[PDB]
Amino acid sequence: SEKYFVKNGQPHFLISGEVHYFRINPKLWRNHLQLLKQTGADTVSTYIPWDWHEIEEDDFDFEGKTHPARNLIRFIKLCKEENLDLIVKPGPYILAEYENQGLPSWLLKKLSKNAFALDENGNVISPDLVSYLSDEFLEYTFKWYDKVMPIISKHQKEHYGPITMMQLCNEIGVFQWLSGKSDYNPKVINLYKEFIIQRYKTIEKLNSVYSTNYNSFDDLKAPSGKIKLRSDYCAYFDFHLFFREYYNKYISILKNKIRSFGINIKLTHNIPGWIYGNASELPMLISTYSEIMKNHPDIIFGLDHIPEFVSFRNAHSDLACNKILEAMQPEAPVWAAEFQAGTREHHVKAYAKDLETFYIASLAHGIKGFNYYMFSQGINPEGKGFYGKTFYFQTALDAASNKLALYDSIKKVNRFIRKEQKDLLRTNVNSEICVGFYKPYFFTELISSQLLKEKKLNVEELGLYIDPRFLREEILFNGLLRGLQTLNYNYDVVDLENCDLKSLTAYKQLWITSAEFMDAETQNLLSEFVLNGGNLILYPAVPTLDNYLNRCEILKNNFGIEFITKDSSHKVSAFGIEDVFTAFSKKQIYNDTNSKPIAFTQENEICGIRKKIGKGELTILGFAFGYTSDEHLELIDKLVKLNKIKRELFVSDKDIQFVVRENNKSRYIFFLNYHNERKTFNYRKSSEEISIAPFSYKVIKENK
Amino acid sequence: SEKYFVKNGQPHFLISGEVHYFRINPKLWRNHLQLLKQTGADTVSTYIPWDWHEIEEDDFDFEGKTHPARNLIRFIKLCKEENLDLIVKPGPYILAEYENQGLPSWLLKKLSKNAFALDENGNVISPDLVSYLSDEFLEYTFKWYDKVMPIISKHQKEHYGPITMMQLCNEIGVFQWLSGKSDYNPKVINLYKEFIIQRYKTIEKLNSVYSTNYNSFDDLKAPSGKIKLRSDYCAYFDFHLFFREYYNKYISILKNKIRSFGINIKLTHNIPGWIYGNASELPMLISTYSEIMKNHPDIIFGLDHIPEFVSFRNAHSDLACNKILEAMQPEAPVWAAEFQAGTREHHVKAYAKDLETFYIASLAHGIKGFNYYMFSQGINPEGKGFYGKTFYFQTALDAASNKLALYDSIKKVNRFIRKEQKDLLRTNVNSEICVGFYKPYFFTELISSQLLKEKKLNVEELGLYIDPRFLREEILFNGLLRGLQTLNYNYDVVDLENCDLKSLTAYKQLWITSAEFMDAETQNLLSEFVLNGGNLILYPAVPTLDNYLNRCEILKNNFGIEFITKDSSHKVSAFGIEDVFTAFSKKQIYNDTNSKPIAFTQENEICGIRKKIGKGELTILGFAFGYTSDEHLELIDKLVKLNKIKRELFVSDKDIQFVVRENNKSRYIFFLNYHNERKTFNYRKSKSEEISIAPFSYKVIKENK
């Protein structure tokens, strides 16, 4: 049932620590590794920076010939001697606050202009930003691979070396997220043209979907600038699809090259997106990897969790991310490839007592393995740091291997995980609620994000009122998912793309946060789900358009729904809850023939109905709410209770969060106090009186 | 030397609690007032909502004829019976999470289009957002004042009523700021044209400053859209100067109207700007009040502090805000008109143990009075809540008057205040460091802010590289001021506008965070400061332009500086500190003439010097740093120590914050732990005392003599 790492044919909790040999005095390599093993960690993880080892063109030092900290071979030997497995990350990009993001200075100086990512005017975006599919870039990457990959191949577990996994590059696409800028390198744009011809076949077909007036594919230009027309939206939508395919073409080239060295170990990639201690943008970054995840069952994506603190302000972020990755990557364990230990930023403190609670919360929230990033602080050699001499602060170990406050917290958590892993890894939560993940709402990193200064997507110019990023961040991520977690209702997430109806029948309710657009396949899926006996909760809009903003009213028609969109006060009443604040003046007002009205505008127009369709049940709310009042928690609670869903426990203090994880034999109850208040409470199934410190936890075991 | 409130010729710490009579069962008003008085509070504060009392047009209820909680008159009488003084706040705007921000529904339905704030297209920005000088808006406002002001006048302290203070309107500009758009209403555009004609006299003089080619003032239009030319920047700069006059005209009209009722009590206004628990934009909002604070010595501005939590992430916001209000309003005590109690937002928790530390930190940080907002929870009657039925959570009292967890925290703090106020209010911190506040850098709410929808200002298009909002947010507010507080160096802030040289000579160092532009008056002031014996630290730029981006090289010439601007690595070395990360590739490279070079680029070019000039000292760094690395604290520490400034205490844990306040009689040592760590440390005045402090907690030590 559960997915988990395995060691010696038994469940294994992967405990890795990140230790950058190239940033640590080599006299202290053994001490760092011993102190890491002594916490109960089983694995160590590092970058192998191209710039650090190809010191000049075709001059490689992996043995400390030119700098003792270039002795990669010795570091691998010490990992083996100190009984740690090793994760290696040879790039070619490593980021990691390393100058030029790990690319050699000599390479960036030598590359032709056409090897760089270019803006729409043919100017170099950044002196350290190559075009991923540049011939010259891949030729040099391949020569780096020809030197580092034989070493990695020799030192795999197979050959009783320590190497058990390898990351390909680092956060593919990250520079487009950070800048909001696409690569317009003509070679990229040629691949985009081929993608469009492949997709539409004829200019007439393209013109019919986009409402363009092209005489041929020769008329077609890559989109740029603000979206003013529905045709611009269409072109940008497909440009996002193209980048997902392009990142798959890149990682496939690296993967096939790596496999040519007989490297048969597990391959990895990593997903960023936390900002200022919350992760509502991370699902957008998950969505950039949609094509890789479809085409590579053998590449495990892990999460980069950067909470910064642990409170009710961010309690919901890690769980939502873990659940969305599980939806998109069901056949691999959910693990944190970069699991905050200390802080990248001196002024952004990472307290041991916060991170200890985050580590236990992560267990509650289904994490199956993690890599403490950074377990060991580093000192940048020889000028090579982008930001200062020091790499991370408040780590488990400083760069000199001094133990810091976090060390004892990691040892304590690791001791618990080792004691419990055989049973804990085989537990799941009993979710009766399923929440739909509609990937096209997330396809906006070039047009609408938390990092994009000037928004290119303004849906009011397109004749729309529900912005997909507002919906996915405030109505879904910070709204419904935060509210369910706060109310201690389990949910699962499901990827609606190519979704199997049979998997939806497990759940008592499916929740769909819908904008005005949804593709035919998803409208058909939801239609069949209800007609066959499913209970659907759908808000804030019945969709009437497809992904290209062309008419598509399958779900509306199948469900017998009629509506007019009308302006009214932001507040509605719903299920007898007065003064429910909603996001929009515009609301769907429903015809109530064969329906039960359950929500009303200030002038008593019907903005929500319940209906029986076939064997199933529909609840439609023509208004948007997230979680910004107690009325929103009341409404989510009432909606869940329509299908008689119960929490696992009665807990006397509603502001205690709990997670019950179970299998046939074992139950774990995780109690999490995300508040600056000592809380005393009691619990029972739906003597037993417990006190939890501020920003703390308690784990109870029950035998069944 | 300290400014503080006075009652009967003695220092008085103003302790107010906000209690909304209109959101509380009137049978429980007395119980709320008694429980507030029992915390040691002396004052209660409330809005008087126009929508609540003018129930239809020209139908007024202040006596509970139509709803018991419209009985304002009984609430005033109960304040008197329960020995609480009263602050009243009749609007016209109140915000207060009240439908339509407090304006009557009947009003917003009746007003014509011209009464609203409009975008550059002519469209209504928000259906509750009026244009302040709208003739129609002011006519209805005056009719509301005609009914509420006689009541306020009758119940003033001078007539043995409880009313001691009144707020005019609420956070002027806040509704516009939150909308993310500026007001292009036609009353506004016409007043702007009069403003420009009065400022420049002839189109030729305007053209000489802006480098424009207008044939007449009739050709000049209110600036709109993005700044592409230095002349666009000039137009928007005057547009900012115009809005500061516009807000002064609004408050002036309200004040003159109020005074006509024989209302002689203290008038107030309240300052917005906290966002998600920090206040880096608050200085922008306070700068919009520049002309009010110059023209109205009798209107006391107070701060609206909304920390939400109390940690290292926002520790510097309240002190920086308190210091900037003191700079703009040096003749009145620094007070919080709204001092967070509970939370306005159910999903944004406010923990008693956080706010108790915030209260003590506020005392350390020089606060002289406050109004706990909200002391009492409310329930909206009759659907009046903007966002739900309940008004505030985790307050001192719930709407029923039950004590909640915060009540005992507020009683504890108030007890310490009442025991100590006679001495505590008279205490000062010994500030050897003065930081300059250059208001023009803040004048960007039309073009560049955290809330503005459209970024109109891109300095690179103007041939500049130092953005005034980046400088004031990251180099000054989150950088220098955060760094000085973290290092436990006391600083004062001084407004450079019409600044007296004698008010700068008391300090060992003056720190100026400078862009490439600075007016001739300020360039001249700083020149005289150093020539006369001042010690000046100036970065990241010697300015070479004035506020209209025209040539002004006064300070460069007076300091005998030559420089070229050159691109290099972000990293520099400064005072032997290697790998100091700086914000820009571009840096100032100084000639070494008659100077000591103290900072170097990766190509070892000189990007900082120190020199002696007349009787004074100059330290110039041609690179920008805030506080985003440990090297930045090292660099600030090195700079402070150039003039042998010392901390007041040796403390064994550098992450403990302290403030020493003293007068002739008493010394108070405030220790603040903004970190989630139980800390045990020792200290001594610069045999050591040992202290253990809880996470997110505080200690106060009083010493006699």
Author numbering:
A (entry chain B): 6 to 691, 699 to 716
B (entry chain A): 6 to 691, 698 to 716
The authors write:
The IALB_1185 protein, which is encoded in the gene cluster for endo-β-1,2-glucanase homologs in the genome of Ignavibacterium album, is a glycoside hydrolase family (GH) 35 protein. Here, we showed using recombinant IALB_1185 that this protein has glycosyltransferase activity toward β-1,2-glucooligosaccharides, and that the kinetic parameters for β-1,2-glucooligosaccharides are not within the ranges for general GH enzymes. Kinetic analysis further revealed that the enzyme has wide aglycone specificity regardless of the anomer, and that the β-1,2-linked glucose dimer sophorose is an appropriate donor. We propose that IALB_1185 be redefined β-1,2-glucooligosaccharide:d-glucoside β-d-glucosyltransferase as a systematic name and β-1,2-glucosyltransferase as an accepted name.
First, we determined the ligand-free structure of wild-type IaSGT at 1.75 Å resolution after solving the initial phase by the SAD method. There are two molecules in an asymmetric unit with almost the same configuration (rsmd between subunits A and B, 0.5 Å), which is identical to the biological assembly suggested by the results of size-exclusion chromatography analysis and SDS-PAGE. In the ligand-free structure, the side chain of Arg349 is disordered beyond the Cδ atom. The side chain of Glu102 is also disordered (subunit A) or flips out from subsite −1 (subunit B). Subunit A of the ligand-free structure adopts a conformation in which both the Leu100 side chain and helix α6 are close to the substrate pocket (type 1), while subunit B adopts a conformation in which both are away from the substrate pocket (type 3). The overall conformational change on binding of ligands is small (rmsd, approximately 0.2 Å).
